[PDB]
Structure formats: C-alpha cells, structure tokens
C-alpha cells in the first residue's frame, strides 16, 4: 500500500522547501523521516496480566502493526516492582505504516484533543528528533468510547537524519505539525 497524502507531502513540498530554508547538495543529506516509536509505562498492568493484553491490542489497531513487550530490569521497591517480571509496552513502526499513523495524528488525534493548543517546540532532544506525550488514547479514530476500560496514557517519538532542531522544526512544520507557537 505504498501511496498516501503525507507520503507525497514530503517529496513534492517539504523536500524542496528544505532546499530553500537552508539548501543542500545531496538528496541523502536532506532530513528524512524514517522511524516512529511508541511507548507505555505500564507499572499499572503489573498486577493484572489481562490489562496488559488490552493495552497492546488497542495499540495494535492505532499503530496499524504488531505490538511488543519490554519488562524492567532494576527494582522499584517503592512501587511494588523488581527484577524481571512486570512489563512495559513499546512498538516501533517505519516505512508505510509509519506514514499512515502520522496521518491519523495531525488529522484525527491532535484535533479532538482536550483543548488542544499545539505541540511544545521545546520537546526536542536538542538534536534532529522529537518526543511528545499523550494522555487519552481514545483520541484515535478506530478507538470506540464504550470499549476503553481505562484512559491508559502513552507517549511517542520520531527519529530523523536531522542534526539540528532548526531543521527539525522546519521539517516538521512543513510535515503538517501544529506546533504551539
């Protein structure tokens, strides 16, 4: 299914625009999107193994991919956690399923967000990448209201060949990211 809006949006719009604001020399130097990642701190689903499957399957739909698991290693004595047992949710996506997700993002999720204002332009890792947090997961389309047993939060990230956050801000804004200016 190699075809979509954001797809060509990067090629026939952002690609040349990046050659304007800074100008490059090689097509392999222009900041390219290539890795989106999700995550869910599930110290909650520690007790119930059932609540873990729920978050992963709800995740499987919104990510349009296959969920994964990643337990802890240390030992949060303070919060009933220790060595190798609990859980942490994560799912990496790229290529096509990456673009399709970014579509639901700035076109379905972000819009109907609780009094959405934008995306904090400080959330940059300093380098050419970005990380954002999100509460309600039901903000995603296919997610039904009479189904979410809990408003399990989660935060996502996204990698890019960029090396300066200025290129990141420019790139992302051109990508359709509504930054809270």
């Amino acid at each position: 299914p190699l075809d979509l809006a954001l797809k060509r949006k990067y090629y026939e719009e952002v690609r040349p625009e990046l050659i304007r604001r800074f100008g490059y020399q090689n097509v392999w130097e222009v900041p390219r999107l290539e890795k989106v990642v999700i995550n869910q701190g599930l110290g909650e689903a520690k007790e119930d193994a059932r609540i873990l499957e729920k978050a992963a399957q709800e995740l499987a739909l919104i990510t349009g991919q296959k969920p994964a698991v990643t337990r802890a290693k240390k030992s949060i004595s303070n919060f009933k956690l220790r060595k190798g047992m609990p859980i942490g949710l994560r799912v990496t996506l790229r290529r096509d399923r990456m673009w399709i997700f970014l579509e639901k993002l700035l076109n379905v999720a972000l819009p109907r967000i609780r009094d959405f204002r934008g995306l904090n332009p400080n959330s940059f890792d300093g380098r050419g990448n970005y990380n954002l947090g999100l509460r309600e997961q039901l903000i995603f389309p296919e997610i039904t209201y009479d189904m979410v047993d809990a408003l399990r939060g989660m935060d996502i990230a996204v990698v890019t060949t960029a090396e300066t956050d200025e290129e990141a801000r420019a790139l992302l804004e051109l990508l359709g990211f509504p930054f809270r200016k």
Binding site: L61, G64, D96, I100, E103, K104, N107, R112, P141, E142
Partner: peptide, 30 residues
C-alpha cells in the same frame, strides 16, 4: 484498507486503517 474519516464538519480523507467507515468529528477541516 482505505480508512475514510467521516468527520462531521466537511472532510473525508482516504488514509489507511481498520474499517474505512471511520466516524470522527472536529478534524483538521474545522
């Protein structure tokens, strides 16, 4: 499958996701 977001304000986008009949609202169109 082409998920057609039918947000009730004047926007029907053909993305990709489970079930094309995606009933939404208050999308980027408004």
């Amino acid at each position: 499958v082409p998920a057609r977001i039918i947000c009730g304000c004047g926007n029907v986008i053909e993305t990709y996701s489970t079930k094309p009949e995606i009933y939404v609202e208050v999308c980027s169109k408004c």
